[model samples]
Target: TIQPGTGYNNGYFYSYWNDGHGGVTYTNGPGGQFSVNWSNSGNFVGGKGWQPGTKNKVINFSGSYNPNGNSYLSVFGWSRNPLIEYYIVENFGTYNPSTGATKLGEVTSDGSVYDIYRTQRVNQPSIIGTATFYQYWSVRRNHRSSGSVNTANHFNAWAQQGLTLGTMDYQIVAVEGYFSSGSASITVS
Candidate 1:
């Protein structure tokens, strides 16, 4: 079991937590497979993927998700140069990520419609450090546990809305819980 931290496992970069309480256990499997069990945590995020992630790639994924509170299953990552955090939210529990976010537009991918939103994080902790940045979101209208994300489709959609991306950074199929408890078994390719 892996604790709170970041490292390489099973040929993928696995990042396990942010600033949260309670307990979290992470396990890595072959290929792009990983699992996470978390409870009573303030905010927890865990997953597996490339460190210097690709800008656009089709990510085929499947998973079993059981979340008790606020949670999200998504293709989550960040970018450098301009410093952006992004999420292509496939499914969510309890809370909608688009709450209070400015609607940029929408995009259809993998047989579902996703509402696009962009938000500003003021002086929040980010991949580079604690700083202000932009967060791009594609929240699915109909949530599902398993599907494929044609990332290029989203990238193009965002670009069309002037939501440009920076240099590629770490990207992963991730599970996130905020002031919640949950468990996820996921595999990505």
Candidate 2:
């Protein structure tokens, strides 16, 4: 297993990997405050302030991305073995594509309908033991600069649709910048 570093910056704990990324704490008040800067490729793996359990979670995010050049803003839940990675995406940069992700139409959970997709991960580098992942995404269609999302039933919903379950490894509330350049920011509370 990959044990990561953890600590608090501003009002949140921050976690990340790779390179070409940076962030600043503007304020931790009311709406909370933070900013991210990235270029090229990198990941904010599992952030501090917003980390929550894999089950029965209700989180609200309020912030925006500058998308100076190109980047992605999304949330991910990583599970192990027969991996099941759950993604809640807010936005994608100009250069990034959902790739070969297969859309599974819309699913309603927690009283909301979310667009769903299924895909696989492959050809990872040596840094992560060359691990590959089976990914699933439940995306809200509208771009929400501010809103609340319920994650309590994401896994079960996928399970009902024939997704294999496993030990959940980590969760990432991140900004992935791929050949991207510019400023990005978002706050989750």
Candidate 3:
């Protein structure tokens, strides 16, 4: 992405963090520059809930969700099947942070959601799973980070899925999303 000169730059999605000085083109995601560059851009919270826009932040999903039982969340590469990933967390609780419940098994669910999974019947083209239950796991991430979610790659910020590195954590896709619908976080003891 950097003409081979930059060190750590995003939009590469997980670039090298090139000194935190100057960057190129200034993208939130790959080639994704927000048209509105307002300082402190505002977000909208309607009945559906938190809606993120370009002027601010975009979220990313950790390869896995929070730890369950005795295990910590672990990450998977881009090629692992989402179904297998979902399979691990299929039953128990929603992997969703908003749900604030536990996932099935010892599974650490995928956190990246790019579309509301509006369904082919609708106009949404999220590559992620269907919106049979949830309205697109994470819409903000879906809106900006993932136009093509629901795959093994998790729709993420680019082609096909999953995290490219291990030094990062999940992204805050929405101020108030649809899943559990709101801003959430965890504090370490």
Candidate 4:
């Protein structure tokens, strides 16, 4: 229940997910200082970001990101209904798509060394209709500094390769950008 920034107090605010057309506005600042601005090119966008409806099972995150191109400053999270995700990436240049997406290798708990991916996100439209899940990514090979994550140890490091994590409902710590131009600011404590 820690939604920091923008307007709307009780239920929290600032949530976004885009697929293109280049437009951004996420400004929730204060102690957790979150900011965003993408002005052009779409295809991907996630500013400020947040989600929490109350179904958690131990998730923690620490962040620090100041963006300006080919960006990423993440601590993405997901779970529940077979949909699993926990990424703690922090690249700042050429971008890293989970080391080729689906490579699935390297796994070290909170000390860092994560380059795992297993993607599957289909159809969309949830709430008992057209849904397809399965998305687990943990890309953190250390790129721009400042990081700390403990989403239950990435679910025991993906269950020691067996891969299994489902129960949590929400998690996010962001500053994502794709297909191009940008401005980012994230500060978490």
Candidate 5:
């Protein structure tokens, strides 16, 4: 069982749990595969992937997802240098992530169109510490459970709109639940 902290197992880094009332649990498998279950108020975010992630690798993934509340199934990661957080959202429930953000543009990948957006987190919790940073988003126009995400496609598209990423950091095919309840089983290659 994976706890609220971050660690590595089976060659993949996994981060789980959040500050909330409910309970969450994560089970790790071989390679980049894991399963998660959460209930009530708290949240869980993290999955199997690389620490120093590749800039433009084609991430092939498959999953069985059932998110009953506010949640996101995505390619989640962070970057340094200029400091950035990014999400290539595949599926979501209840709340849409693009809410209140400025839509930058759009990009098509993995057989779907994704609306791109940029939002700022001022003096918020980040991979490094409490700092301000920009969050780049590519939220899918339609939701799906399994597919491939060519990181270069979104990276290039974001660049076209003057949204650039900094030094690559930990990246994961993550399932995030916020003040909600849900479960997921995911595999990434």
Candidate 6:
């Protein structure tokens, strides 16, 4: 059941601050992974000369990021693959604890390009900067359910149209939830 309380009510897009658990976060599984053909490029980031349609596993150019196409992550579809890699298209800026606000304006804004997708791939270190700000998950009103969820549906739902395993680095302004138990909420811009 979806809990009710003071929470994020973003009309369109919102960001999250991932804790990086093994399941989906930024510390554990999100980072530190080298999945490749073993006969080719090992660990790769945006600047690592890796593109869509690279080898048997990834797409070096994938016909180009489809900047003008639909952007979203399908958890169920991706989980079907024996291998998974997390890729980050954007990270924007950072959060300031002292200011208690995010620097979303500082980071490149995809405002005209609004859409968050969920995928597994290696991302560059947080070159986007520190945490005077942060980003986590972006959720739409898609009736996402993770309670009593299986790897199939659970993963898919959590990674639905917008909600997935990722953070905005600084899009998130505040968080006050702990495992959906109760009295939990997140605030993002």
Candidate 5, poorest ten consecutive residues by summed lDDT = 15-24
Kindly give the stretch of ten consecutive residues in candidate 1 with the minimal lDDT sum.
17-26
137-177: candidate 4 lDDT, tens digit per residue: 77777665455566556566666776776655445566666
Candidate 3: worst-modelled 10 consecutive residues by lDDT: 45-54
TM-score of 2: 0.73
User: Which candidate achieves the best lDDT against the true structure?
Assistant: 1
Off by over 4 Å in 6: 1-10, 22-173, 176-182, 185-189
Off by over 4 Å in 3: 1-11, 14-102, 107-125, 128-189
For candidate 5, the lDDT comes to 0.87
After superposition on all C-alphas, the RMSD of every candidate to the true structure, in Å, is 1.1, 4.8, 15.9, 16.0, 1.2, 19.4
Question: Which residue ranges in model 4 land beyond 4 Å of their true spot?
Answer: 1-10, 13-26, 29-34, 37-68, 73-75, 78-93, 100-135, 138-162, 177-181, 184-189
Tens digit of per-residue lDDT, candidate 3, span 12-78: 2221112222221111332322111111112221110011111122223321122121111111111
lDDT of 1 at 161: 99
Estimate, for each residue in 39-137, the C-alpha lDDT of model 1 and write its tens digit.
877887888877888867888889799888899999999999789999999999899989988999999989999999999999988988899999999
Query: How high a TM-score does candidate 6 get?
Result: 0.16
User: What TM-score would you give candidate 1 relative to the actual structure?
Assistant: 0.96
Candidate 5, residue 156: Cα displacement in angstroms equals: 0.7
Model 2: colliding residue pairs:
13-48, 13-49
For residue 108, model 1's alpha carbon misses the true position, in angstroms, by 0.8
